Amino acid sequence: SGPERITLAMTGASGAQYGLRLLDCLVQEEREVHFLISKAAQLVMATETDVALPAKPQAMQAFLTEYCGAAAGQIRVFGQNDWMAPPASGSSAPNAMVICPCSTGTLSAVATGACNNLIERAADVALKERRPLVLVPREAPFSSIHLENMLKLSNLGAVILPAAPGFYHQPQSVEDLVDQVVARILNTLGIPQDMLPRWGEQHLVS
Amino acid sequence: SGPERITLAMTGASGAQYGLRLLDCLVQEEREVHFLISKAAQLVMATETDVALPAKPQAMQAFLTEYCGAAAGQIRVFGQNDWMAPPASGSSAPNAMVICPCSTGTLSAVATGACNNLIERAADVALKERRPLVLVPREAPFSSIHLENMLKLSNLGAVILPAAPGFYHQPQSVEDLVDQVVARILNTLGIPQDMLPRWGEQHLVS
Amino acid sequence: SGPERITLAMTGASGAQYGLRLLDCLVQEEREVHFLISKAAQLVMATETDVALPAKPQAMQAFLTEYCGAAAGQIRVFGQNDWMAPPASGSSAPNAMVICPCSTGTLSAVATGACNNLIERAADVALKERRPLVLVPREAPFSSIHLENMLKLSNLGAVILPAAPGFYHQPQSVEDLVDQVVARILNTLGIPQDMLPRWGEQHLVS
Amino acid sequence: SGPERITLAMTGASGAQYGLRLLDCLVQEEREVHFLISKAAQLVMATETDVALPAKPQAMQAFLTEYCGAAAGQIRVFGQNDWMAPPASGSSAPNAMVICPCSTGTLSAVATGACNNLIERAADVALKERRPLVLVPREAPFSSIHLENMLKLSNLGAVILPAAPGFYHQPQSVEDLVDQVVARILNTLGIPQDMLPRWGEQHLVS
Amino acid sequence: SGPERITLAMTGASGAQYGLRLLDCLVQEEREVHFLISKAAQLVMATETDVALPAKPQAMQAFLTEYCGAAAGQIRVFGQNDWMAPPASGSSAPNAMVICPCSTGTLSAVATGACNNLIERAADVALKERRPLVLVPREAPFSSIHLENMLKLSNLGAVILPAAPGFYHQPQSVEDLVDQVVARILNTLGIPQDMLPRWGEQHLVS
Amino acid sequence: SGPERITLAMTGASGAQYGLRLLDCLVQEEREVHFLISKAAQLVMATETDVALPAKPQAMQAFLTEYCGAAAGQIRVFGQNDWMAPPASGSSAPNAMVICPCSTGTLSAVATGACNNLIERAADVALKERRPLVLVPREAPFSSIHLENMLKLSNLGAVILPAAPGFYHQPQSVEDLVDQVVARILNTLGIPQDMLPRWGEQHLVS
Amino acid sequence: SGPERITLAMTGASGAQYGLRLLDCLVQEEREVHFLISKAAQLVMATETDVALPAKPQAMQAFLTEYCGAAAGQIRVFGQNDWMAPPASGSSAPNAMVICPCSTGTLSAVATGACNNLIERAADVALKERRPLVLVPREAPFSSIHLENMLKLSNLGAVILPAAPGFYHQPQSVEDLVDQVVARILNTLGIPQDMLPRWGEQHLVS
Amino acid sequence: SGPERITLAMTGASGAQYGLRLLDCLVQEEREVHFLISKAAQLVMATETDVALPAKPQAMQAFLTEYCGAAAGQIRVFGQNDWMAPPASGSSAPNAMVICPCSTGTLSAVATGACNNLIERAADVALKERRPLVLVPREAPFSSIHLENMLKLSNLGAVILPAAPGFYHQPQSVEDLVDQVVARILNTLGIPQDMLPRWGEQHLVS
């Protein structure tokens, strides 16, 4: 159940832990992941994590395959101007797409249809083919510009899933909060997860 | 610097830790706090925390005074239908107002001008007097209904500050993430805080 | 085929027969039903029917189980402020939701995102998770306020299915008209029904 | 009291019983009725009723006069392109107009101002002269296209009265439900009726 | 001339004197008054006036009958959840409706179609039946939320009559200013009044 | 996979080759096709192709069955006013619908909800039941009227798929370009096709 | 605290007492007042008050200086076409501006940006420099034209403060009601006043 | 007749044949062409054609001059950041501008006024000087983002001419379809062409 292929895009918002954890969970569920990462997102990961991600796609692809324990060919890495990659065309095989985390800059580009890189093209392709598109914005405060861009995409079928974890399962660590958001993303995709239990499932009567 | 009085309202969104931590920081900065809490928010606090908050205003006021080490009269607690409380009238002394956390239900009420309790009246009063109003929504995903309500209030001068903590200062605990959001709220209010350093302050040239 | 679980909410519009008949059909199709009923809807049922529905959830749950011949645990009844019930959280297992009948007051609450009870929260949750939401309004005339609320929800993916039965299968009783509307609801949910035949199915050529 | 002349238009929505019953009630109240019926509505009446309505205006006029026990000249029947009929011009004597039932196609035509037949012209004339116009739509679900057309006309003064009968007077037959809707239409027109009692008229105090 | 029955609703805005004076004038003009009063409005009347209004409908009805010198059955009082009262249904006998004074909270409820009590239902019924609806808001400043709600209702046919008395007849007391507003309300209803003379009636030429 | 039944409508835009090729591909995938064709579309086919299509449904149905090598009953042809055909009612069995090619006139009718023929009714039914609806407009330039109609339908869930073939697979004939568009339509429907390969499927890394 | 200079404009709405009382309070707080008055406002003052205001600026300035006990140069009076006055240019020293009372005609001019006199220019200058602008409309009913103009200005930062006094401090005279509105204006400006006490200031707990 | 100078911009949409054929036709009509081509468009031309276009402007200019048989100086090639080129300034000599083909990314940039390269600046200049601007989008499906951008530009005077060739002149090759679109572009520019005959020119009477 859920999509066989997922386009996972990481952009330069804080919350690089969310994207890496999502990537790992997708691998453990035996999903094929088309991995995209912006230049600013590489800076964020170097600043916020101890993950030393190689810069070029192929070295990055080999590193990520090792980091998550993925099978050969399970993780595909595509550069930011590789228009020959599957996500660049609606004639490609159907993927679900997640931008996690999603910068306000990338949010604006997708909202206006700017196609300045492969992440922005892939999101444009997902909307025109009405394939799943999940944006995980991380920003505070949300300006009216941010909110109008989120509202326009939400009206068009995209899922605006902010990196705003809930506390209703007594989190004990940063990792508990990261897992909580990733579990919502997996729920939204229809992919099984055991980190976030189904609320009230054994609650029969008030 | 910053407001002498703050109306702190807590509603039934997850993230009760944010409101309690904000209340404590406000007390440490020697601010007078008009504390409001919804019935659903009391359920959330009992579920998510080990804080045993008394139910009625006066017992609640004595408890909170002890819990934060506040001076006598520094924390005022007002019931949900006490229209004689200062926040209910624009002729009151000027306060800043924070709803943290802010449920989508309370977000909707403030956006539409529904005045079904003192929290909703106080927010209506803040907007009509153009006094500061900060909403801290905690929800995921954000629906188009949520986004339209946030956008309308943002256009009217309210600050939409989601409970979406950043990771760019290497958080080591849940408490680090809670402090990060509370620090943004204090920054937005113009109240001093030392939990979140000023970004790039010693960065002279690229 | 169709949803395994359905949140059936009844609100204080005339047409209590529609909701009871839908509940019975859902039970006969071996579906799990999370049953919600407003205070005004209880008054409507007492006025319009000879069904003597018990007031509290558990007594109501036992009564409804007997009334429809349902298996144990097949019908769950949840009170109007039971936030621990599954419908209150998007982290719950996926349900389809039907408000039948839907008052103009509940229509307004769902349109604006007011979350004043569990019915209104559950509808808010369904929209944010993009799970099925069917509203069955019963009102005449429709004001512009009613129509704007229906249009906003329809634009957001909700199904506005008014209690306006068709006559194109020669109805002979009130029960025929009630069955006609319930069959449209079941069709909309993707649940099998034999009360409303498939139009023109054996019509080969003009 | 109420209008002396009524333009009654029937279009190809299910619910031909509503229009025939309304026509009969109007005759019993000694009102002059300008009767219009679309080609699709004639098909609906043949399918849904045992009324064998003649096809051409004059034969149709003689039949309807007999069917309702109307006086000579009380019922006028006008063909779909008879621009010499009173409803086609705002310089005519003032009528109230009812489209019952009203197809979504005719609803769309009136909303956009399309004047492709005499029914659509007459409705255009009623709106420009600000004479009463009641639309009785029968459709389920209501699409956003349907709802936008109803909302536009409602904003312009038309009454959107859906064929959604109430059950709060214990209906015992299809005829009770048909009478309920017709009574609302008569109430809206200001014409006396005894089928639907005045709600709460003898209810002095709670 | 003017309406035989008036639904007079009082809500929790300052200006309780306006509603009591209007009620008295309506009684002196031999009109039947369906009186509704919110819980907050009862607090306002106790604070702003020396009128000791009984709390429950029937005691309140007997008191008001004595206070205005009304005939038996001339004043009907209905509780806030009495859905059996005439104002709750459009099938009732036609009334005009006045909300005086009208809180911003009730203004918001009527604008959005929220039907949380009988006052809000009655206003919803008045708009859908296109029966007169006069709102008398008392608030300062008017926020953009207040203004959008007033504008939406004004566009829908409601009369937005603020408690903003004119001074162009040399008022000598608070009672002169209260009478001035009540006279505008009576003028708007088409009910005779002698408190506010017809402007320029004997002004023949400049 | 994909829909078992497809309503294929052809209207009077240039590009009759697209519709005939789509019809053939649907037959080869063993799908049941409900075929509708406008009067203007018949003129276009006679002008642009050597296909001699019979005028009346039944003769047309026999011809099309032979032309595509379809099984008996696989292709159903319905006249433009046959309201007894399945597409005319939402109570019919679920179909996907394609208008290929789609004139600007039919685009306008579907956008406004005009139901002047069975093609326009069927599209209205598809939108209200939220069943797939694909429009293949052929026009140049696109006016603002055309664009507003396409945008409104796109916002409502319809797929606006213009007859604008891509050249990125080195087309060698008109037939290659026709096949390219038909393949996008089949992709959009979820029906297998081998004319348009999946873009970048074997592209592992940049 | 508060602005050192205030542009006080009086226009031809009823409520000349409000403007004169505001002018006096501003003088008592030692503020410099740039006084503007329309031709219609002069007629209103002659009709509604016993103040005999001289017609030309300089005589008017000497009179007003005596009437309020102001220091020399404290009150400046500028004619309606004196473009050399400070309020006519954004390069002037910063003022706050109040139009009290504000006619619907002047409200319309400021909303649309009409600059037909110095009052309208000064308001245009205040909005473009984002300096305080308070409008005190006096009208009843408010039309939709009035409400749209107020809403547009409110959205742009202007304060719409209607002459709608509250009664929650037991007013005993017309002068009490005039003082109540003037006190709100002074509160809005941030200027000290003792006529309207701070609501609930000594209300510690419910 | 028609413009003496044309700014021909090619962007990275499929349909490079359209732009090359248009360029050739413009040369044959003795027009001066200011040629712009994006980096992505160069990739498209290498993929879709056997044209080996040199990368740098001057080598590209010499190649194109030879490829079309143009006179010296007839084709000017300008790099993507050459702000000294005529198209970058509205003070330049008047040109008509065509973007053929036009990517959805460039469509978005022109719609929002983004000026990230000379193609986008030139289009911004054309709109502000109200000089002709023709966009030739090639995409399928058109998303709502695409459609809103096209509609905004169409409303502003730009011609949205999709690469959607007609078939009503019996095309026999890909080249016939390419010529058909190019002929519409030339018609829109007012430049003579003989590839597309004038429809119905010798059709005297029906």
Ligand SMILES: Cc1cc2c(cc1C)N(C[C@H](O)[C@H](O)[C@H](O)COP(=O)(O)O)c1[nH]c(=O)[nH]c(=O)c1N2
């Ligand atoms: C360490 C760090 C942290 C952040 C950022 C930067 C850096 C270096 N930036 C700014 C962001 O990277 C910038 O706007 C880029 O232009 C985003 O480009 P992409 O959208 O990734 O192409 C950023 N932007 C944002 O919208 N939300 C955020 O939380 C952050 N946080």
Ligand SMILES: Cc1cc2c(cc1C)N(C[C@H](O)[C@H](O)[C@H](O)COP(=O)(O)O)c1[nH]c(=O)[nH]c(=O)c1N2
């Ligand atoms: C433990 C727990 C946790 C949550 C909630 C409930 C409970 C019991 N609720 C639902 C919320 O309380 C409900 O909509 C109330 O109606 C909110 O009422 P107030 O806005 O506080 O008056 C809730 N609502 C929301 O908008 N965001 C959230 O994160 C949560 N989380």
Ligand SMILES: Cc1cc2c(cc1C)N(C[C@H](O)[C@H](O)[C@H](O)COP(=O)(O)O)c1[nH]c(=O)[nH]c(=O)c1N2
């Ligand atoms: C017998 C009877 C019948 C009706 C009602 C009431 C009663 C007692 N009410 C009014 C409705 O109950 C009221 O607006 C409630 O506030 C609705 O509350 P909920 O939406 O159920 O919480 C009602 N409301 C509505 O929108 N449509 C209807 O057909 C009816 N009919």
Ligand SMILES: Cc1cc2c(cc1C)N(C[C@H](O)[C@H](O)[C@H](O)COP(=O)(O)O)c1[nH]c(=O)[nH]c(=O)c1N2
């Ligand atoms: C028996 C039967 C029943 C119905 C219909 C048809 C038939 C034959 N039609 C379809 C409708 O007649 C069609 O859209 C016509 O084009 C309407 O034309 P007029 O609006 O009457 O000119 C129809 N249309 C609609 O909007 N609501 C309905 O309930 C029905 N029901």
Ligand SMILES: Cc1cc2c(cc1C)N(C[C@H](O)[C@H](O)[C@H](O)COP(=O)(O)O)c1[nH]c(=O)[nH]c(=O)c1N2
């Ligand atoms: C003495 C006093 C005076 C006022 C109020 C309160 C009290 C106690 N309230 C607040 C108002 O009562 C509150 O928003 C209630 O929620 C209104 O509820 P109803 O609309 O009456 O159901 C109030 N609200 C408002 O909109 N305008 C006003 O002038 C006042 N004045």
Ligand SMILES: Cc1cc2c(cc1C)N(C[C@H](O)[C@H](O)[C@H](O)COP(=O)(O)O)c1[nH]c(=O)[nH]c(=O)c1N2
């Ligand atoms: C040969 C030929 C070619 C075309 C046309 C006509 C003919 C005869 N028409 C015009 C179209 O047929 C006309 O607007 C009809 O009214 C469309 O009616 P339907 O939408 O099919 O009912 C047409 N219309 C359009 O929108 N796009 C097109 O490409 C064409 N091409």
Ligand SMILES: Cc1cc2c(cc1C)N(C[C@H](O)[C@H](O)[C@H](O)COP(=O)(O)O)c1[nH]c(=O)[nH]c(=O)c1N2
């Ligand atoms: C005694 C008296 C009283 C009033 C008025 C007039 C007079 C003579 N006028 C009408 C107003 O003066 C007129 O519309 C002028 O054109 C307003 O011009 P200024 O806006 O002052 O330039 C007026 N206008 C308004 O909007 N509200 C009001 O309350 C009054 N009252």
Ligand SMILES: Cc1cc2c(cc1C)N(C[C@H](O)[C@H](O)[C@H](O)COP(=O)(O)O)c1[nH]c(=O)[nH]c(=O)c1N2
């Ligand atoms: C072979 C080939 C074919 C296409 C594309 C690419 C490639 C390599 N791209 C994607 C497009 O080039 C991308 O969005 C660029 O960012 C466009 O940049 P410019 O607008 O030319 O600056 C593309 N984009 C689009 O909107 N429509 C199309 O038909 C195509 N086709």
Ligand SMILES: CC(C)=CCOP(=O)(O)O
């Ligand atoms: C890279 C590429 C083939 C882009 C075009 O894809 P599509 O046909 O616009 O979905």
Ligand SMILES: CC(C)=CCOP(=O)(O)O
């Ligand atoms: C409780 C109270 C005095 C409410 C009225 O306040 P305001 O004058 O509307 O700001």
Ligand SMILES: CC(C)=CCOP(=O)(O)O
């Ligand atoms: C009762 C409860 C857990 C509400 C919060 O749910 P969600 O995470 O907002 O979908």
Ligand SMILES: CC(C)=CCOP(=O)(O)O
């Ligand atoms: C048939 C006729 C006279 C139509 C014109 O009427 P009107 O003057 O437009 O109201």
Ligand SMILES: CC(C)=CCOP(=O)(O)O
């Ligand atoms: C209390 C009651 C009968 C509510 C329903 O009234 P209506 O038919 O919706 O006008």
Ligand SMILES: CC(C)=CCOP(=O)(O)O
């Ligand atoms: C031909 C026909 C039954 C039309 C009515 O269908 P629906 O119930 O409006 O979906």
Ligand SMILES: CC(C)=CCOP(=O)(O)O
């Ligand atoms: C009277 C005058 C200088 C008007 C121009 O002022 P501004 O520079 O437009 O603020």
Ligand SMILES: CC(C)=CCOP(=O)(O)O
């Ligand atoms: C390169 C250049 C002169 C840009 C400015 O042109 P314009 O005056 O803005 O039309």
